[PDB]
Amino acid sequence: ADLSLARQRLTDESVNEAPRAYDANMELVIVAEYPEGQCKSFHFANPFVIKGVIKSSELMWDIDNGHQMSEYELQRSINGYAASHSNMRQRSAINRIPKKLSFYLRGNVDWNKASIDIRGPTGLSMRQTEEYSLDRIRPPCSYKRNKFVDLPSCGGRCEKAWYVELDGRPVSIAVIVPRNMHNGINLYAGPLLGNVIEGLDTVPECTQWFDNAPELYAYHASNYGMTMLDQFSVIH
Amino acid sequence: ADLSLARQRLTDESVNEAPRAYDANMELVIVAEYPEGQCKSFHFANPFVIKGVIKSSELMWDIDNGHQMSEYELQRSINGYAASHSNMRQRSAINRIPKKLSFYLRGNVDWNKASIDIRGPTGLSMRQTEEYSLDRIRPPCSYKRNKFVDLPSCGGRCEKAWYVELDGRPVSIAVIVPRNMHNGINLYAGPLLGNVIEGLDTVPECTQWFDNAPELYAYHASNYGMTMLDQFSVIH
Amino acid sequence: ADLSLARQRLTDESVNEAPRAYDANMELVIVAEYPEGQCKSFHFANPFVIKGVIKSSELMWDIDNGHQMSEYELQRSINGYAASHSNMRQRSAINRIPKKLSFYLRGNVDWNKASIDIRGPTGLSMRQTEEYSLDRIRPPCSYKRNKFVDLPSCGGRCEKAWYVELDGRPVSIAVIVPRNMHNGINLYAGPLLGNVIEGLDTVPECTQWFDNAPELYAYHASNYGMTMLDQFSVIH
Numbered sequence: 001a002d003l004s005l006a007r008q009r010l011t012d013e014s015v016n017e018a019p020r021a022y023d024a025n026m027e028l029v030i031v032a033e034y035p036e037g038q039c040k041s042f043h044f045a046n047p048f049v050i051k052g053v054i055k056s057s058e059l060m061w062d063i064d065n066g067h068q069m070s071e072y073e074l075q076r077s078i079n080g081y082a083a084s085h086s087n088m089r090q091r092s093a094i095n096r097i098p099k100k101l102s103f104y105l106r107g108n109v110d111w112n113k114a115s116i117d118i119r120g121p122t123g124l125s126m127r128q129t130e131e132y133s134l135d136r137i138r139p140p141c142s143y144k145r146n147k148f149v150d151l152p153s154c155g156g157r158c159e160k161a162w163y164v165e166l167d168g169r170p171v172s173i174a175v176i177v178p179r180n181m182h183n184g185i186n187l188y189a190g191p192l193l194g195n196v197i198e199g200l201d202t203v204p205e206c207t208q209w210f211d212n213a214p215e216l217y218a219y220h221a222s223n224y225g226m227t228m229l230d231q232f233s234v235i236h
Numbered sequence: 237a238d239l240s241l242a243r244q245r246l247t248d249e250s251v252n253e254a255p256r257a258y259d260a261n262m263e264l265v266i267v268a269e270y271p272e273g274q275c276k277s278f279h280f281a282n283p284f285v286i287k288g289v290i291k292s293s294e295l296m297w298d299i300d301n302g303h304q305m306s307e308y309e310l311q312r313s314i315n316g317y318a319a320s321h322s323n324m325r326q327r328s329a330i331n332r333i334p335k336k337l338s339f340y341l342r343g344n345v346d347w348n349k350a351s352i353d354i355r356g357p358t359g360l361s362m363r364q365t366e367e368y369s370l371d372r373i374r375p376p377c378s379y380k381r382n383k384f385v386d387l388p389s390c391g392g393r394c395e396k397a398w399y400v401e402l403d404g405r406p407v408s409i410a411v412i413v414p415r416n417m418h419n420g421i422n423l424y425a426g427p428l429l430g431n432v433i434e435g436l437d438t439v440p441e442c443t444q445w446f447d448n449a450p451e452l453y454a455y456h457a458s459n460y461g462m463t464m465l466d467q468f469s470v471i472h
Numbered sequence: 473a474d475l476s477l478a479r480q481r482l483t484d485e486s487v488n489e490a491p492r493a494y495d496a497n498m499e500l501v502i503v504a505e506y507p508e509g510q511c512k513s514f515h516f517a518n519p520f521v522i523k524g525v526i527k528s529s530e531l532m533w534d535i536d537n538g539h540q541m542s543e544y545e546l547q548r549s550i551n552g553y554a555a556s557h558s559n560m561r562q563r564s565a566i567n568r569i570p571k572k573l574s575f576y577l578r579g580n581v582d583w584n585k586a587s588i589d590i591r592g593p594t595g596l597s598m599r600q601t602e603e604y605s606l607d608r609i610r611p612p613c614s615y616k617r618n619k620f621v622d623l624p625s626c627g628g629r630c631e632k633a634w635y636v637e638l639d640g641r642p643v644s645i646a647v648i649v650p651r652n653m654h655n656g657i658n659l660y661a662g663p664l665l666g667n668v669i670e671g672l673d674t675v676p677e678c679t680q681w682f683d684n685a686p687e688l689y690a691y692h693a694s695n696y697g698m699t700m701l702d703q704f705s706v707i708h
């Protein structure tokens with residue numbers, strides 16, 4: 001047996017299987033695409049539960065003539081969608097609302113229980129008439145299961161995505177991504193629990209802005225190894 | 237029996253009782269009111285533990301001639317209250333410090349254990365002489381219990397509030413709101429624990445700015461069904 | 473026995489031992505020092521697990537002619553370090569990257585398990601070639617143990633520090649600081665667990681900017697009782 005090829009094989013497998021390890025992160029990238037094709041990406045990671053929580057103000061395209069707009073200004077625009085005649089806008093804000101959201105998940109994910117909840121502009125459960133009395137988490141619809149779309153992970157057998165088209169109204173996002181424990185062991189049971197609790201919510205988030213999707217593909221997706229799908233069903 | 241009225245009754249009860257469900261959110265709205273009557277509201281929600289954590293810089297009225305001030309500028313002003321002669325201010329910043337804070341809680345709350353802790357300008361336990369050695373959470377005074385004021389929830393039997401007048405010094409806030417488990421069942425016990433842990437800290441926050449209290453009543457309180465009390469003891 | 477001295481002694485001990493109490497905070501101050509000597513400090517606290525999580529954009533010196541720069545502008549500069557030719561910079565950004573980081577820990581810390589992880593510019597595990605497949609938390613190197621440096625805590629016997637020199641590239645930070653439970657009792661075991669979970673992540677953070685280290689010593693360190701060490705090995 002050729003040991004140079006054996007070494008290559010071991011190297012490949014070490015990279016492919018690493019996400020299955022204890023304390024190895026699951027990965028979440030959310031991409032918002034806007035009408036002129038610009039993109040905003042949000043990255044979250046954790047080994048046990050990813051909690052991808054995005055305010056409606058964070059999901060707006062927030063660049064105006066080269067400067068970043070404030071939460072105050074953005075929330076002012078969002079308000080008129082949440083409550084009738086609560087701001088002074090004479091036209092809509094659709095230029096800054098995403099057309100499409102893409103959710104890229106990679107790693108040792110419990111695909112039965114991963115939930116993606118698209119919520120209202122002030123964070124309440126989405127419905128025709130949002131109200132505090134009827135506000136909850138993890139609605140039945142949020143569990144996508146076999147509605148996830150499989151994508152190449154280049155040997156990892158571990159990337160899927162979900163896509164949604166928005167309808168011209170601001171939204172907020174709550175994504176909960178639990179670790180696969182279908183090997184029959186409860187990591188929250190016994191003395192290990194404290195070690196798991198210590199690891200929750202310990203990875204820095206990262207938000208990036210791109211003027212077009214090819215910049216996203218070139219400087220995020222292919223830089224780090226998250227495969228993305230474009231509007232022509234071609235992978236990058 | 238009139239079935240149109242029976243249907244109305246069932247509908248009423250479905251709305252009134254929904255917050256008692258597993259995975260139904262408890263709701264927290266904090267309102268800061270400033271000397272010229274403007275208001276800032278902060279909304280938090282969770283089914284298991286609400287953690288309402290606000291920095292002193294976030295609690296300042298932060299609008300200056302139509303633009304939002306930066307954390308850098310706000311913290312600079314706060315500093316002179318925390319440490320003598322640590323900024324260059326020749327006058328106080330009382331114009332931007334809240335006069336009053338109102339805490340509105342709605343849902344299946346453990347009223348015995350809900351805690352509201354008003355902390356110092358850099359997040360330490362409040363005392364005459366703040367110091368790292370004497371910094372802790374959940375002081376005895378923070379549990380309000382029967383000092384909560386009952387307010388109408390329009391059939392829910394589940395809203396209370398707490399009020400405090402400030403004394404011209406910046407503060408920070410830590411509110412911990414645990415779920416009522418007085419039905420005798422520990423949701424943290426057994427296999428359910430992981431499901432509870434997954435649900436913690438998964439709801440987007442929302443901050444709003446209003447120029448006067450009637451805007452708050454019209455476009456937040458009555459829009460979503462949180463009853464608020466004004467300075468004339470009239471509900472909205 | 474002189475009871476005025478006995479009272480002094482009891483007072484001293486009450487202050488010295490307070491951090492050992494249940495619900496007493498452990499304290500973390502991170503100080504970034506930049507080439508012109510300016511400093512940024514970040515304070516975190518919790519009684520059970522401190523989670524000090526800082527994005528690469530937050531660690532840049534972010535003041536430009538008296539105004540605070542936006543995350544958009546800062547992330548743009550960081551991008552060129554993460555992905556080749558992903559921004560339009562013709563020179564580096566070393567003026568705004570810390571030269572040195574200092575980590576000050578005070579309280580009832582588990583020194584065996586405290587971990588300080590210096591991560592890449594977009595939050596991934598640091599390595600020559602950062603990639604999503606090889607991203608994890610709590611690497612073996614992050615546990616400093618006896619590589620912590622002991623510093624005076626003025627009777628508390630409970631402050632240590634860690635120092636690192638950076639190499640001109642932006643980084644992100646994840647610090648996990650667990651409570652000392654070497655007295656043989658597991659606080660996550662039994663009915664106490666819910667009370668611990670309720671206390672996680674409930675203390676407001678505080679970020680401060682200083683133009684030079686003596687301002688930091690005078691208006692933070694000596695104001696609150698965190699001892700710091702300067703470049704001459706002198707304490708403040």
Ligand SMILES: Nc1ncnc2c1ncn2[C@@H]1O[C@H](COP(=O)(O)OP(=O)(O)OP(=O)(O)O)[C@@H](O)[C@H]1O
Binds near residue numbers: 153156159229234235
């Ligand atoms: N262009 C595409 N559009 C949609 N789906 C695609 C496309 N290309 C591949 N896929 C799907 O991705 C999945 C994985 O494909 P494949 O096995 O070729 O990738 P791989 O590099 O071996 O990665 P993995 O280790 O994740 O399997 C398959 O279900 C395949 O149909």
Ligand SMILES: Nc1ncnc2c1ncn2[C@@H]1O[C@H](COP(=O)(O)OP(=O)(O)OP(=O)(O)O)[C@@H](O)[C@H]1O
Binds near residue numbers: 387388391392395
């Ligand atoms: N204007 C007010 N000022 C102060 N307290 C008030 C005011 N109006 C009502 N309350 C108090 O609110 C509480 C609930 O009142 P009430 O039972 O009339 O409301 P409800 O619409 O039935 O809501 P719930 O289902 O929460 O009881 C009572 O304790 C009442 O005294």
Ligand SMILES: Nc1ncnc2c1ncn2[C@@H]1O[C@H](COP(=O)(O)OP(=O)(O)OP(=O)(O)O)[C@@H](O)[C@H]1O
Binds near residue numbers: 623624626
């Ligand atoms: N200037 C210094 N540079 C480096 N280390 C120092 C310096 N001064 C003191 N130390 C170290 O700090 C540690 C604690 O010193 P010391 O016992 O004098 O302080 P203390 O005020 O009693 O505080 P504690 O209660 O924390 O012991 C010792 O290991 C000492 O060597």
Ligand SMILES: [Mg+2]
Binds near residue numbers: 155157
């Ligand atoms: Mg394959």
Ligand SMILES: [Mg+2]
Binds near residue numbers: 391393
């Ligand atoms: Mg009633």
Ligand SMILES: [Mg+2]
Binds near residue numbers: 627629
């Ligand atoms: Mg000593």
